[PDB]
Amino acid sequence: CXXXXXGXXXXXX
């Protein structure tokens, strides 16, 4: 899980 902004971000889960 994760996400972000401006293009994306990251996460994991």
| Residues contacting 4, CB < 8 A, separation 6+ | 10, 11
Amino acid, res. 7: G
Q: Where are the beta strands (DSSP E) in the chain?
A: 2-5, 8-11
Q: How many residues in total does the chain contain?
A: 13
Q: What is the DSSP letter of 6?
A: T
Q: How far apart are CA 13 and CA 6, in angstroms?
A: 21
Output the six-digit token pair for 11: 């996460």
| Residues contacting 5, CB < 8 A, separation 6+ | none
